[PDB]
Structure formats: C-alpha cells, structure tokens
Design a protein around this motif. Structure first.
Motif, PDB file in Angstrom:
ATOM      1  N   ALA A   1      -8.554   1.754   1.976  1.00  0.00           N
ATOM      2  CA  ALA A   1      -7.655   2.858   1.693  1.00  0.00           C
ATOM      3  C   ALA A   1      -6.718   2.559   0.533  1.00  0.00           C
ATOM      4  N   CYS A   2      -6.290   1.298   0.401  1.00  0.00           N
ATOM      5  CA  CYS A   2      -5.352   0.926  -0.657  1.00  0.00           C
ATOM      6  C   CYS A   2      -5.972   1.095  -2.036  1.00  0.00           C
TER       7      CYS A   2
ATOM      8  N   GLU B   1      -4.318  10.615 -11.371  1.00  0.00           N
ATOM      9  CA  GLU B   1      -3.208  11.539 -11.531  1.00  0.00           C
ATOM     10  C   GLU B   1      -2.267  11.087 -12.637  1.00  0.00           C
TER      11      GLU B   1
ATOM     12  N   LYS C   1       1.910   2.247  -3.422  1.00  0.00           N
ATOM     13  CA  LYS C   1       0.829   2.994  -4.045  1.00  0.00           C
ATOM     14  C   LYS C   1       0.784   4.430  -3.562  1.00  0.00           C
ATOM     15  N   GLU C   2       1.205   4.682  -2.331  1.00  0.00           N
ATOM     16  CA  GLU C   2       1.336   6.076  -1.918  1.00  0.00           C
ATOM     17  C   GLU C   2       2.524   6.770  -2.591  1.00  0.00           C
TER      18      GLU C   2
ATOM     19  N   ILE D   1      -7.734  -2.227   3.154  1.00  0.00           N
ATOM     20  CA  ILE D   1      -7.935  -2.449   1.722  1.00  0.00           C
ATOM     21  C   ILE D   1      -8.767  -1.324   1.121  1.00  0.00           C
TER      22      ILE D   1
ATOM     23  N   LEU E   1       2.080   7.816  -6.279  1.00  0.00           N
ATOM     24  CA  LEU E   1       1.281   9.024  -6.412  1.00  0.00           C
ATOM     25  C   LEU E   1       2.104  10.249  -6.060  1.00  0.00           C
TER      26      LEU E   1
ATOM     27  N   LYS F   1      -5.895   4.812  -2.841  1.00  0.00           N
ATOM     28  CA  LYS F   1      -4.572   5.230  -3.298  1.00  0.00           C
ATOM     29  C   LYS F   1      -4.286   4.752  -4.718  1.00  0.00           C
ATOM     30  N   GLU F   2      -4.761   3.554  -5.071  1.00  0.00           N
ATOM     31  CA  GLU F   2      -4.644   3.070  -6.446  1.00  0.00           C
ATOM     32  C   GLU F   2      -5.415   3.948  -7.432  1.00  0.00           C
TER      33      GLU F   2
ATOM     34  N   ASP G   1      -6.477   7.039  -7.085  1.00  0.00           N
ATOM     35  CA  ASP G   1      -5.939   8.383  -7.203  1.00  0.00           C
ATOM     36  C   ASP G   1      -4.628   8.387  -7.971  1.00  0.00           C
ATOM     37  N   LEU G   2      -3.845   7.303  -7.874  1.00  0.00           N
ATOM     38  CA  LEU G   2      -2.702   7.138  -8.766  1.00  0.00           C
ATOM     39  C   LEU G   2      -3.144   7.087 -10.222  1.00  0.00           C
TER      40      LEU G   2
ATOM     41  N   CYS H   1       0.828  -1.199   0.000  1.00  0.00           N
ATOM     42  CA  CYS H   1       0.000   0.000   0.000  1.00  0.00           C
ATOM     43  C   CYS H   1       0.864   1.250   0.000  1.00  0.00           C
TER      44      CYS H   1
ATOM     45  N   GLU I   1       4.392  10.889  -9.089  1.00  0.00           N
ATOM     46  CA  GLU I   1       3.683  11.477 -10.219  1.00  0.00           C
ATOM     47  C   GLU I   1       3.275  12.913  -9.924  1.00  0.00           C
TER      48      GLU I   1
END
Ligand code: MG
Ligand code: MG
Lengths: 1208, 115, 114
Positions: free
Chosen positions: C11-12, C22, B15-16, C9, B19, C15-16, C18-19, B12, B22
């Motif tokens: 939150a994960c 962006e 994944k932070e 999960i 971001l 984050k995916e 929003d990746l 996780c 980017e």
DNA sequence: TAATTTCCTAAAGGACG
DNA sequence: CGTCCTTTAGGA
RNA sequence: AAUUUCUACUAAGUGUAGAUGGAAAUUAG
C-alpha cells in the motif's frame, strides 16, 4: 490666464532619488577576488564603536569645561525675568541679555582647550590613542587611519551643539532656555512654600547624602544655576526630586517625595517642582526574547510582588481617609464614571451642575461662550478628591468600595489568565517555530501583557499629577513603590511588538567605500581623479563607473574614434556656494599669482563692510563687484567653461544679487565622448567597476507610464533643462545583504493559472509564461545608489505664498473650493463647489479608479479594509494584523493624493482640510487621527512640487515646471489656519446642519425630571397638529431656550416629517407622527387644539416625560444610520426651506450632480467648503495692506449666520 | 516488530498526507478569494481522519494564497492575507469559525464550493 | 516475520506513486497538444524509481486529452485522441518515443519541455 | 514616534614618497 | 612633483 | 504576485496605476 499659471518657480527643494546598481560584466567578481567587500563591512561595524568612543571623549571634554563656566550676566536676568515685564518696550533688551548669556557660555567651548584640535584629523590620530588604555580599544582607532575625512558628516553633526541659533540641538539653547526657565520657575515655587519644609525630617539626611556642603536652600536660590548645567548636578537635582538610591535597596525619601509625604491635611490643589533636561529588550534573537519574557515577567519577578503588595494594599483601601485620593481629570473620567456607576460623564455633569450653580446666574439661558469657557476651565481644573466623588454619588453609595472591588477583581482576572497560561512559564520551554511566524506562544504573551497593561492604565488615572499637597499617605507609599516596579512591563510590551512585527526582509545596509574616504564627492570635470565616479550614458541606459584605488587615472586618455561603440560622459563641474567659494579661491595664495597688492579691496574685505554692519557704498560694494568680475575674467579654469554674461554696474545694488547670478550660472553639464572597446577592456582587466543604474522603467518591456523619479532622472539630461533641475553631489552607495535565504524562497509556478484578487477585475484568471517570485529582491545581494538632486536652486518669482494666495483670491470672482473630510461609510468624501455655493461635483473615494490606455479599472478599498478588519477580528494575536491596517492606510492615502493634485489643476481651487488640533471627534470614524495627520504631511510635501506625469515636461505643470503652492511642512502642531492653498478649518457644527436651511439641533433633550421637562415645554411657543400636512408644527424661540446663544434666526418651525432610526445595541426604525399619536393616545390627550402646551404640562407621571423626551430628541437627529449596512443612511431636515418642501437625501442620492449634498458625509465636506467660501467673502471686505492679518479661525455664530443667510 | 513497523507506517501516513495536500493545492487555486474555506493550520502533519479536534493548539482562519517552495515543490499555504507572513505547510479544511471548530470539511464540499 | 507486512509495503508504494502522478497531472494539463510527450501508459502503477524498462508490452505513443473522472478525482488520460477512446490512468514520460525506450524523463525535464 | 538640526562641495594646503 | 587626504569659507 | 522603496495589484506578459527625501546626530514622549 489661470491662477496656477502665476504659481511657478517659487523656492528651493532637496529630493533624493535612489536607484539600484546592477554590476555589469565581471565587476562583481572583481569586487570578490579583489577582496573589497568585507573591508567596508568591517569598517561599517566599528564606525559606531569609534563614534561611541569619540562621544565618550566629548562628554569628558564637556565635563572638563562646564566646571569652569561662569555666566556673569545671571545676577541681572534673574531680576529682570522676575519683573513681570509687561513688554512696554523692555523685553528686547531682555532678549539681548539672553543672547549675551547664550553667547558667553559658548566662549569657553569655542575659545579654549584647543577646539581646532577637537574636530580636525588630529583627534583620532593622537588624542584618542591617549584617551584609551585597553589594547582592543586602541586597535579600533588605529584602523581608521587615513580615513579621517569620512567623519565630516558626523563632525557637522557635532558643531551644532556649540552654536547659538536657538535650535534645540545646541548646548547653549539647552542651558539657557531649557534650563534657566525651569530654574527660575522651580525657584519661585521653592520660594512660595519655603516655610513648609523643616530641618529634622528631610534636611538632616539631604545635607549629608547629596553634597555634605552648601546644603539645600541655596540651590534654587539665585546664583546656583551655574552648577546645575552638568550631568552630576542635574543628577543631584533629580535625586532631590525623584529620590536618592544610597547604593542600596532602601530608596529613601526625596523633597518632591516630601511634598508627596506632607499630606496630613487632605486638600491638595497646589503644584510641585519640575525635573530638568540634559544632553549627551529583545531585537537580537528569539530565545533572548523568551529569556526576557519568562525571567523578567514570571510570577517570581518583583513585578508580581508589586501586584500582590497592591492586592493587600487595596484590601486596606477603605481603612484610610475617604478624602485623600486625588484622580487626574483628562480622558480618564469618562471611563471612571462609567465603571463606578455606568454612565459616561455624570461626574462631569455633576461638576457642570455645580459650576452652573456657582458662576452662572439664575437666568434660564446658558451663554454658549460660558459653555466653552466652562469646558476649557474643566480642562484647566486639576483633579477631584474622593470626597467630591462621595458628594457626586447618591445616598447609600460610597465610591471607595467599587474601586477596591473592581481593582481586586481585575487583578483576579490577571490571576485567572495567568493560571490558565502557566503551561508556558516553565523556564525550559522549547520553541517550535520562528516567533515571527509562530502563533501559539504569541497569544499567551498577548493576553498576559494586555491584562497587566490594562490594569496599569486602570491605575494611571489614580495619581492626580503626583506632585500635589495635602492628601492621604500610607496608601500612596506602597502605591508608588509598586507602580514604579509595575510600569516596566509596558516597555516590554513596546519591545515585543518590535519583535513580533519584525520585517521578513532586512533593510540593513552599509556604506561602500572602495578604499577611498573621498568616495563619491560630486559630479565634476576634473575631480574624477579623486571621487572616482563618473556617469556614462548609452542609448537610454545609464551607468555609474568607479575605477579603483591604485589605478586612479584610467578615465583620461580615451577618444571618440568611431568604433561603432561610444559611451557618453558627463562633466562640467559646479560652483558650490560662491558667497563662500570666491573668498576661498581668491585670497588663498592666488592673489599674488594673478594680481599684486592694490590693498583698497583687501581693506574693505577686511572690514566686512560690503555685508551688513554697513549698508553699502556704491564704491564699497562695487569695488568687490568689479574686482570679482574682472578677476574671474582671467581665471582659465572657469571663464572659458562658463559664459558670464553679466548685468551692468548699477544693477548690483547689493552683493547678494551678483552672488545669486553666479549661483544661477555655474552648472552646465553636457556630453563627452569615450569609445566602447577600450573602456570595456578596462572593465575586463579589472581597473574600472562599471555598475548600471536600474529601476523598473529602464527595461525594454516597460511600456507604461514611468516612475516620477525616473522622469526626473531622464529630465536631468534633457536639452530643455537649463539650470532648473541640477544634479548636485553628495551621492552615496549602499549594499543590502541577501536575507531571504535560498532554502526559504517561495515562488509561483510557470504556466499555471493564477487567480485574480481584485473583485472588479473582469478577466478572472491569469496565466504566466514564466516564473514570478515573492520578494526576490531581498534574496540577492543588491547594491542601491542614492543621488541627491536639487530642484529649483535659483527661483525668480519670489514672494510670500500666504499673502499671495489671498491677494490673488480677492481679485478672483469665482474661486472653486475642494473640501475633504472623513466619515464612516466613506473614508474620504470629495465635494467641489463654486464661488456661489453651487455644488459642481461630488463622489466617495471608497473606490479608486485606476485608468490606463483608455481602460479604467476601479479599485475598491473599503471592502479590502473590511476584509483586513475581519481578519483582525479573528486574528488570535492582534499584532501582525493591526500593523498592516496602518500600512494599508498609508498605502491608501498615497493614492488620494493623485486625485487631489489632479483636481487642483483641474479646478484652480484651494483645498479645505479638517483640522485635528481643536476637536475630539466621534471615535468611530474610519480614518483615525494618526492616519489623517499622516495624510496632511503627504499633501503638503506633494504640493511642494506638484507634477502630473502625463504632461509635457517643457510646459507648465510639467516636471521641469512644477507648481510650488505651499510651504514646507514644519510640525504637527504648526498646522494653523493657512498653508499655501491648504486651509485648515475646524469641524464644529459641520455634520449636524441641514444644507438647505442652516438649521441646527442645539438643545439638550435628554430626560432628568418632570418639572425641568415642563420648563422645556413652557419654553416652546406653539405645539399644534396641522391637519393637511399631517404633522405637528413646533414653533420655538431660541431666546426661550438655554445655551442657544449662537444662533441667528432663533425662530424655527420644527416638524414630524419622515421616519427616524432609534438605537435601542439593537436597531429600531420608527415613523414619527404615528409614534406621537401612540404616545398621546397612550396617555389620552385630544391633540387637535393647536397649541396644547398647557395640556402637556398637566401629566404627572414619570413614564410619560421619560418617554416624551426620547421622542422629542429623536425628532432632531439627522444622522440616521445603522452602522451595519453601508447603504442604509440618510440625513433629513425637519424644517421647511424657503419654498416649503423638506430635504431628504433619498431625493438627491439618485441624481447626477445634486445641488444639495448627497449623503451624511457629503454634508460634512460641503459645510467644510462653505467656511472657506465665507473666508473668500471675508477676503474682499478687507484691503490689500491688511490682507495678511485677516482672522480666519471663524467663531460659531458667524458661521451660523453665514449658513442661514446662504439660501436667502 | 510491533514498534518497528509503527516506526514505518508513520512514514506511510506522510505519503498519504502529501497526496491530500497536493489534492488540496490544486483546488484552492481554482477559487475566488471570497469563497476560500476556513482551514486549520500547522507545521506538523495533520491527519484528516481523527485530527483530535478538541486540542486547544489550533485555530480556524481563512486561507489566503496557495504557493509553492523553490527547490522542492512542497505547497506551503498563506493564512490570512499575504503581508501577514503566515506561511504554513499543512492545512485541513473545516467549517468551524475561529475557535469553535465544528467539523472537518470534506473534499467534495470544497469542490462544490466553486460552483 | 513476513506475513502481513507485505500488504503494508504494497500500500505504501501505491500511495507514493499516486503522490507522483498527482504531482505530474497539473504539469501534464499545462502543456500544448503539439508538445504532449510520449508515455509508457499502463493503467497499472508502474514505479518511477526503476520504470521496469525491460518489457516492450507497453506501447509508446503520444498522450492526448487529460480529463478528470466524474466519480472520483482520478486523472484519466487518453492516448492519441478522443477517437481512440483509450481511457488510461497511469502514465510516465520518457524519451522512448516509438518503441525504443532509452532514458527517463524526470520532472524538471517535463517542466522545461514546455 | 515626533521635533530639530547639519549636509545634498570644488579647491587650496600640505605630508610624503 | 604627483598623490593622496584635510581643511576650508560664509551674500540678504 | 515581480518593485529604488511602500501600497494595490497582474493590468496582456520579466510587468501596471499612484506616491516616495535620503544619510547622520540630538532631545522629549
Ligand atoms: Mg509605471
Ligand atoms: Mg505586496
């Protein structure tokens, strides 16, 4: 007319254009499915191996035939060079004896043992099978069968070994001039001190371990030069000199080691013998570099044992003799004296004081020629003893303690940086990146390698030439046997920098063959059937065409027809070297077919009586002339193709003129028609590989100014190209591998706003409508093609250029001069001046103003170089960061050259370049030595065929008609005082001279003692404060002062005008008159009495004259910079001019084109230009017969007289 | 389990990080080159919460070009000028000079550094 | 064994996604307005791995101006024009133009859509 | 790295199939 | 008798 | 940040302005 109008068409030139080959159609697939690629690739990977085996056999041949040489003429030449020849017309028969020696050694090579079965095809077919017994080795040589003729390049690189041309690449010039000269030198050195060496200490072991017969003393003597010519004999020579191995680790003493052992007196100063010449680590992977590093440079290594032996040896450093240490003078003593005491050249100052006591008299003026001779003799005197450093040190200071302590503290620094870095030295260390990109590991190797290499340089001074007489001994034993172990770490240093600065690309390539040893011979008419390589032109897009092996005649039966598609085809073969070609074609079983047995011509060719060895006879040479002229006249292959419009019977007053005429007429390339559909079908069927020659000006998008090379390749088929630029053969073909792997590319994205890196670029952000990649051209398997062109094969205006420039410039009335020089705030400062001395333009070259389409966008380089040096400051590895500065400088000098070649045709000038053989410069100037030497090599080879792209090719200056206003560059030591227009001038007394007066600071104005300062003051004449000018006028005579011999007026009126810049490193600006008022009222002297020299020789404290000497020196600086701000620098004159006003640079920087130089650098260029103006004045004094011998290397006093006579 | 989701929350945090990378890559491109901030670079991912800034295996140089790979869109970075061949995948903006790293520069600090 | 880890999960996946948005926002801004594709705008994180394409609640119109927030760095999106004042923060492109959602627009087909 | 060479060739001779 | 290499020849 | 190749770039969109002589061998540092 111009002067450059005459300088055209002088001599010949060989340039290699190169180009990229784009495969067109399915031809790349034809190479792939036809299984054609790996064949050359495996051929170019054992070609080195069979070349190595052939050199092994050639060394076997030389080892065979050198044991049967005998130079009979030795017995006389050993006497005649021991004659002290005094010339007197005796050395030319001496040179005839020498050429007889170097001929008679070649007679065994070129005469016997076959020698035609040494370089023909027979060797790799028969002899190298027999010369090899391993099956894998014979498997290599049985592969190149049929491809023997590919070695003609290597064989022509073999047959230079056996010749007699006094080139270094012979064996003859080796075994005479590199062997006999040192033989008789070492023989005479042996004969001087032969009574030094006894039997029972070196001879009793060297009589049995080296030879076991003819023991020692006959070797240097006389007739034993006829053994040392081989590798084993020079190996015994080296074992006498360096010391034998005797297959074990004792490494017993040699004879030169016995002169390093004969030290029991302690007064060396005498030379030893010299070794002799003889002919014929990483860079694999990353973990091999790691293995080499941590296995040959761990603390477990013998090198660290040598370090610990040195530590215990320097623990015993003071227990030896304090007079038996010699240290070699050179660049080292400036740091030696600065690390013992703290002052730069005080040991040089102490020897200069002593030599001032010895050879100079008791008179109060030093001769400046005696100063230059003292400098050259101090550079000539070999070394100084440690007792001479005891006498140069003061009381209560023995010098051996500081050397011992700082040596132990520096290897302690090595110890501490080792112990802080032992975390890498575990031998199971696992990497994380490529070390080309990795930084955490490279820094450790850097800081350890720099410590051990700096201590190696710290001890490299402590030899004194090594081969010296009486000294100290038992220190020196462990010293040398630790230093020989230590010194391999510097080769490791040079190897690892050849891995961390590896290329990200790969310029590995190999030679394409296409199953043909006769691949790409030359551009021709009939030999398309053999070389299989023809150039086809379509529109403005070119093609090379290779057919194949087993369809070798597919370019014959093609016609015009008009199918609305028609490639053109180029033909009209050459005639290579008619002076050797016409006997090859006219006496080789062709005489019977066309003629019969006249015989008269056969006999005079048989004598060779049309060459020299006879002058000529007008029947003898001209029988050859009309015999050729009429035998050609029926040759159906050529006589229809070439018009031989020839001159008459009396013009050919030699044989070279007719040969030069047929050299002129023998190259007539034109167009042949061949229609498109059938040749494209031939490509489709796979009988003809069709490549496209490509560069980035061939595309339809390229609307800018093309490459110069592309201009040549376009001009090669112009209708104005008569015979000037010929496209000669010898072209090749190379393929580079794709090395940037496709999982490793980076790429800018399309339609994304990308920023601009040039600060003066007025558009601030750009968008790209497609993708652009980084180094895409390495990510494709790319073919590259090299063609050699020959420019100006037949010139007309033939003359020596160095005489021609002088005889032209003497007739000239206003010759312009461009002077270039280095500097600190500016990298190169251009001045340009007239015949009078009037400056006409000047600027800096920190900015290069690229112009296009009427828009000019300036490119700074200095702030870019400041950015890259700022990166080197915080670099953490200093090896990828310091190479790019070097390449940027060799990317910067490649753009000043266009400005210089513009200015030369702009102003008809000559160029004056700062020499770099005879000066030790300030070591602070930006463009250093290895860049300026690179610059002069790139100004000569551009001036060899000077061409400006934006001109008419037909006219003068254009690419058909380049000026050739220099000679060929030869070497970095062969650049002396003239080459073409490029004058080399030394840079003495060039920066520190006012350009309005010609004044120089020439004194020695730093403090030592009071009575010497009072001698200085009494040597002045007037020290009176003028009230209305508010300064102190110093009238002085250079006849009063020491070392002031070189001046002209010797009567100057110094002043306190303006302010100066003190160093203090800090920064200190001081206004001078107020400072002098403060120093006077600090010591209380009424300074309004005009002359007060008696008043100034009445103070008795050190604190005044130490403080007055600094101010008196700072009166004369004229070099006033901070070196922290590029804008704050000025050169100012303490002398009135012919009017009476001074010169401040501040008055002239803010002017349009100042009649004086602007900055401190423009003064340097302007004074380089004045020396060439003086040379112009010298050129008119002499006459047209002596103009080739005018001495230009101007001595200082002449230059000073020219400079002081400039303003009248 | 307590060593299983901590073999998962590590996925996780990447994944932070991506971001953050980017978000950085879209703001370095918008700068003039004399206003590029000093960063700390590595090829392992670097958490801008802790960073363990006392670690001696990291320096603080300027950032040169911001580019993208070919097959993926992963934004590599060039530290120093182009020809150094110093490609790196993870950067964190700081304000400290070459070896004395003062503190980690935040996002609005870089955003305001454009002016 | 399923008590707090659902929040991890939860939150994960945010984050995916929003990746993903962006990754998308720069390609969104580099498009002309006559090529601005059709979105499934929600102002709710809608997972691009499945797209949950069964629900016709999501309107499908053409995206307008792509501004940035001034408080945070979030990619605010407008549908139609500014005159609708429809401030949405989650879009995914498809070829589902009006209401007929068929197939997903992936990243290479919004880059090549330019 | 720098110094110092050779080449920047079409045509005859011939081996062979 | 093509075909395909090997060798070859020496200005001022 | 494209390139025959290097160097600076973007320079108006697959590029711009300059330069560039290769292939091989040998010697010495
Ligand atoms: Mg161009
Ligand atoms: Mg570049």
């Amino acid at each position: 007319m111009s002067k450059l109008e005459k300088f055209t068409n002088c001599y010949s030139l060989s340039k290699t254009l190169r180009f990229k080959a784009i495969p067109v159609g399915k031809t790349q697939e034809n190479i792939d499915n036809k299984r054609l690629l790996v064949e050359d690739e495996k051929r170019a990977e054992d070609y080195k191996g069979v070349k190595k085996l052939l050199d092994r056999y050639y060394l076997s041949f030389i080892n065979d035939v050198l044991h049967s040489i005998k130079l009979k003429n030795l017995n006389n030449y050993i006497s005649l060079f021991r004659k002290k020849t005094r010339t007197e017309k005796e050395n030319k028969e001496l040179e005839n004896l020498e050429i007889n020696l170097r001929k008679e050694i070649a007679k065994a090579f070129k005469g016997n043992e076959g020698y035609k079965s040494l370089f023909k095809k027979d060797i790799i077919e028969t002899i190298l099978p027999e010369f090899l017994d391993d099956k894998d080795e014979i498997a290599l040589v049985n592969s190149f069968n049929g491809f023997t003729t590919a070695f003609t390049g290597f064989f022509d690189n073999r047959e230079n070994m056996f010749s007699e041309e006094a080139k270094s690449t012979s064996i003859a010039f080796r075994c005479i001039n590199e062997n006999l000269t040192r033989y008789i030198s070492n023989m005479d050195i042996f004969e001087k001190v032969d009574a030094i060496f006894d039997k029972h200490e070196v001879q009793e072991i060297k009589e049995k371990i080296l030879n076991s017969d003819y023991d020692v003393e006959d070797f240097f003597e006389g007739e034993f030069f006829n053994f040392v010519l081989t590798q084993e004999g020079i190996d015994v020579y080296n074992a006498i000199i360096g010391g034998f191995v005797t297959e074990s680790g004792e490494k017993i003493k040699g004879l030169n080691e016995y002169i390093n052992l004969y030290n029991q007196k302690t007064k060396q100063k005498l030379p030893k013998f010299k070794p002799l010449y003889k002919q014929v680590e990483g860079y694999t992977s990353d973990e091999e570099v790691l293995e080499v590093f941590r296995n040959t440079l761990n603390k477990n290594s013998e090198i660290f044992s040598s370090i610990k032996k040195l530590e215990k040896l320097f623990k015993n450093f003071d227990e030896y003799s304090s007079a038996g240490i010699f240290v070699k003078n050179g660049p080292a003593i400036s740091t030696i004296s600065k690390d013992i005491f703290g002052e730069w050249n005080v040991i040089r100052d102490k020897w200069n004081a002593e030599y001032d006591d010895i050879h100079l008299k008791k008179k109060a003026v030093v001769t400046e020629k005696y100063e230059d001779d003292r400098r050259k003799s101090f550079k000539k005197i070999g070394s100084f003893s440690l007792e001479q450093l005891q006498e140069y040190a003061d009381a209560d200071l023995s010098v051996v303690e500081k050397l011992k302590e700082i040596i132990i503290q520096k290897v302690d620094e090595i110890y501490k940086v080792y112990g802080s870095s032992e975390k890498l030295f575990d031998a199971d260390f696992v990497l994380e990146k490529s070390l080309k990109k990795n930084d955490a590991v490279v820094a450790i190797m850097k800081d350890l390698l720099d410590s051990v290499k700096s201590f190696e340089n710290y001890i490299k001074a402590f030899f004194g030439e090594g081969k010296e007489t009486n000294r100290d001994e038992s220190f020196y034993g462990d010293f040398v046997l630790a230093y020989d172990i230590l010194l391999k770490v510097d080769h490791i240093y040079d190897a690892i920098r050849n891995y961390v600065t590896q290329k990200p690309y790969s310029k590995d390539k190999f030679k394409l063959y296409f199953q043909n040893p006769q691949f790409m011979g030359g551009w021709d008419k009939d030999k398309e059937t053999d070389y299989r390589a023809t150039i086809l032109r379509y529109g403005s897009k070119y093609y090379l065409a290779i057919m194949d092996k087993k369809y070798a005649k597919c370019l014959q039966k093609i016609d015009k027809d008009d199918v609305n598609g028609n490639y053109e085809k180029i033909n009209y073969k050459l005639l290579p070297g008619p002076n050797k070609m016409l006997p090859k074609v006219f006496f080789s079983k062709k005489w019977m077919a066309y003629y019969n047995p006249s015989e008269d011509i056969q006999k005079i060719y048989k004598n060779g009586t049309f060459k020299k060895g006879d002058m000529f006879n007008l029947n003898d040479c001209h029988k050859l002339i009309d015999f050729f002229k009429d035998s050609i006249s029926r040759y159906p292959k050529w006589s229809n193709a070439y018009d031989f419009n020839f001159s008459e019977t009396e013009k050919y007053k030699d044989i070279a003129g007719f040969y030069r005429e047929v050299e002129e007429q023998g190259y007539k390339v034109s167009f042949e028609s061949a229609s498109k559909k059938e040749v494209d079908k031939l490509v489709e069927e796979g009988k003809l590989y069709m490549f496209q020659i490509y560069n980035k000006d061939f595309s339809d998008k390229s609307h800018g100014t093309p490459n110069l090379h592309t201009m040549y390749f376009k001009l090669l088929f112009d209708e104005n190209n008569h015979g000037q630029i010929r496209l000669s053969g010898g072209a090749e073909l190379f393929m580079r591998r794709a090395s940037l792997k496709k999982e490793e590319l980076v790429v800018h994205p399309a339609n994304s706003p990308i920023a601009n890196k040039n600060p003066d670029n007025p558009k601030k952000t750009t968008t790209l409508s497609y993708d652009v990649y980084k180094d895409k051209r390495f990510s494709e398997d790319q073919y590259e093609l090299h063609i050699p062109i020959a420019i100006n094969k037949c010139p007309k205006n033939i003359f020596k250029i160095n005489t021609e420039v002088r005889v032209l410039l003497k007739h000239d009335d206003n010759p312009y001069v461009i002077g270039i020089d280095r500097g600190e705030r500016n990298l190169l400062y251009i001045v340009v001046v007239d015949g009078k001395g009037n400056i006409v333009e000047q600027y800096s070259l920190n900015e290069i103003i690229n112009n296009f389409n009427g828009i000019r966008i300036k490119t700074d380089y200095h702030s870019l170089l400041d950015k890259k040096e700022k990166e080197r400051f915080e670099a953490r590895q200093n090896w990828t960061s310091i190479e790019n500065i070097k390449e940027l400088k060799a990317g910067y000098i490649s753009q000043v050259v266009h400005k210089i070649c513009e200015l030369v045709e702009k102003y008809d000038a000559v160029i004056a370049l700062e020499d770099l053989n005879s000066g030790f410069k300030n070591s602070r100037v930006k463009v250093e030595k290895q860049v300026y030497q690179k610059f002069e090599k790139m100004l000569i080879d551009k001036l060899n065929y000077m061409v400006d792209k934006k001109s008419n090719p037909c006219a003068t200056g254009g690419a058909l008609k380049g000026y050739q206003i220099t000679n060929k560059f030869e070497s970095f030591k062969s650049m002396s005082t003239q080459n073409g227009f490029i004058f080399y001038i030394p840079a003495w007394l060039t920066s520190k001279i006012d350009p309005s007066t010609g004044f120089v600071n020439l004194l020695k104005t730093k403090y030592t003692s009071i009575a010497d300062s009072k001698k200085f003051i009494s040597s002045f004449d007037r020290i009176m404060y003028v009230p209305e000018e508010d300064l102190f006028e110093f009238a002085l005579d250079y006849k009063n002062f020491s070392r002031t011999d070189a001046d002209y007026i010797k009567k100057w009126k110094l002043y306190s005008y303006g302010n100066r810049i003190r160093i203090f490193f800090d920064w200190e600006e001081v206004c001078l008159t107020s400072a002098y008022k403060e120093l006077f009222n600090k010591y209380g002297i009424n300074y309004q009495q005009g002359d007060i020299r008696a008043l100034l020789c009445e103070q008795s404290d050190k604190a005044f004259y130490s403080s007055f000497m600094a101010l008196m020196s700072l009166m004369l600086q004229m070099r006033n910079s901070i070196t922290g701000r590029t804008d704050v620098d000025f050169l100012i004159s303490p002398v009135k001019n012919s009017d009476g006003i001074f010169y401040d640079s501040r008055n002239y920087e803010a002017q349009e084109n100042a009649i004086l130089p602007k900055n401190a650098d423009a003064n340097g260029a302007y004074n380089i230009a004045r020396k060439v103006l003086w040379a112009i004045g010298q050129f008119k004094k002499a006459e047209d017969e002596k103009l080739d011998k005018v001495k230009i290397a101007i001595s200082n006093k002449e230059w000073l007289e020219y400079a002081q006579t400039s303003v009248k | 389990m307590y060593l299983v989701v901590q073999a998962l929350i590590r996925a996780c945090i990447i994944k932070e990080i991506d971001l953050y990378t980017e978000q950085l890559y879209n703001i370095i491109k918008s700068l003039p080159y004399d206003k590029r901030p000093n960063v700390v670079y590595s090829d392992q991912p670097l958490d801008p919460n802790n960073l363990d800034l006392s670690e001696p295996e990291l320096w603080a140089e300027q950032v040169g070009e911001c580019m993208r790979y070919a097959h993926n869109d992963q934004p590599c970075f060039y530290i120093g000028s182009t020809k150094r061949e110093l490609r790196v995948n993870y950067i964190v903006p700081v304000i400290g000079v070459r070896d004395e790293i003062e503190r980690v520069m935040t996002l609005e600090e870089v955003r305001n550094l454009h002016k």
